[PDB]
Structure 1
Amino acid sequence: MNIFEMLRIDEGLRLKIYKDTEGYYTIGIGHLLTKSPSLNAAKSELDKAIGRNCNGVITKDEAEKLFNQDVDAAVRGILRNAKLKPVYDSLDAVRRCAAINMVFQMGETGVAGFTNSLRMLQQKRWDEAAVNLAKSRWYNQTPNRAKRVITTFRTGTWDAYKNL
């Protein structure tokens, strides 16, 4: 397992515009297009992102390219953020994937707000971090995915993704 396989499991792959768990227009492997309720706005963002007139549909190669861009952006968001970078740098490789997953789902600013969880992660207090991470809208709204990401932080293993 690696971060691409992990997020591919958590986000799926859809080649036509869909709504994500929050009702926002999305495509591919969890690529958010817009929070606007307008499908036309989402189609415009799609064409801008892909560089052609897509009419709401993309290829698997195009989805994978967006996904590469989005993972890269999540990692860069972590490295540029003064709250996130030291915690990330402190982690092992498996737990770094859990961090990237959170930033991919909720964005850099959102994750940087998890102040107490971040401290517990930096201190390697894994069970405490796991309990704190679950005290969140994130966990309550997407509990199966949050449970997988939290188990990954708790254990430093891929056990939550191995059954799938």
Structure 2
Amino acid sequence: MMQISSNGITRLKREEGERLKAYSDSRGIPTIGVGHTGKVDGNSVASGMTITAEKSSELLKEDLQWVEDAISSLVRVPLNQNQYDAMCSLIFNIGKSAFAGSTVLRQLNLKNYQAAADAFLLWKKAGKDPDILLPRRRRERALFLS
């Protein structure tokens, strides 16, 4: 079945940021790679853990299973690989419940692909800045339409 591509992983890494040495996120959660909070090689992520870029990518591919599963369960129209990779990036950011209720999903399921692409641009607010995610949304939209 369809899964994120290597291009999709590179682009997502470059939107999210990669950190190959464990750190504490802004809430206090030990994290490594691209948002990996679970174990690595059977150990809890903790200060002192390092990983390779290969490991970071393989951890991300596994952590995306909920995203891929959301696409499979909710999306009822065909997606090309660029569309799929762009959707993975959006959903990994905004989360499953936000995606489930989104205009992106509604439009895609109507086979209104251009309108679905445009509706990425709605997911632009974070905190006190109403458009800080808009550049990322524009890049994802461009990937979708590629």
TM above 0.5, yes or no, is: yes
Going from structure 1 to structure 2, the CA distance change for 1:133 and 1:66 (only over 3 Å counts) comes to: same
Going from structure 1 to structure 2, the CA distance change for 1:102 and 1:135 (only over 3 Å counts) comes to: closer
Cα displacement (A) at 1:146: 1.5
* Equivalent position of 2:23 in the other structure: 17
Does 1:6 find its partner at 2:17?
A: no
Question: Deviations along 1:12-66, whole A, 9 cap, x unmatched?
Answer: 32022153xxx344321133x3xxxxxxxxxxxx5xx122255322311543332
**One-letter amino acid of the structure 2 residue matched with residue 68 of structure 1:** K
Going from structure 1 to structure 2, the CA distance change for 1:97 and 1:59 (only over 3 Å counts) comes to: same
Kept after mapping to 1: 8 A contact 2:67/2:88: yes
Does 1:151 find its partner at 2:138?
A: no
**One-letter amino acid of the structure 2 residue matched with residue 17 of structure 1:** Y
Going from structure 1 to structure 2, the CA distance change for 1:53 and 1:142 (only over 3 Å counts) comes to: same
Does 1:58 find its partner at 2:50?
A: yes
Instruction: Quote the Cα distance in structure 2 between the aligned partners of 1:128 and 1:106.
Output: 19
**One-letter amino acid of the structure 2 residue matched with residue 74 of structure 1:** V
Does 1:98 find its partner at 2:50?
A: no
Cα displacement (A) at 1:98: 1.0
Instruction: Quote the Cα distance in structure 2 between the aligned partners of 1:113 and 1:93.
Output: 23
List aligned pairs for 1:123-162, cutoff 5 A. Answer: 123-136=110-123, 137=125, 140-153=131-144, 155=145, 157=146
Going from structure 1 to structure 2, the CA distance change for 1:53 and 1:129 (only over 3 Å counts) comes to: closer
**One-letter amino acid of the structure 2 residue matched with residue 76 of structure 1:** D
Q: 1:108 aligns with which of 68, 72, 96?
A: 96
Does 1:70 find its partner at 2:63?
A: yes
List aligned pairs for 1:23-38, cutoff 5 A. Answer: 23-24=26-27, 25=29, 26-31=31-36, 33=37
Structure 1 counterpart SS, 2:62: helix
Identity of aligned residues (%): 24
When the two structures are superposed, what TM-score results if normalisation uses the length of structure 1? Answer: 0.64
Instruction: Quote the Cα distance in structure 1 between the aligned partners of 2:19 and 2:117.
Output: 31
Instruction: Quote the Cα distance in structure 2 between the aligned partners of 1:85 and 1:127.
Output: 15
Bigger fraction of residues in helix = 1
CA RMSD of aligned residues (A): 2.6
**One-letter amino acid of the structure 2 residue matched with residue 104 of structure 1:** F
Going from structure 1 to structure 2, the CA distance change for 1:132 and 1:65 (only over 3 Å counts) comes to: closer
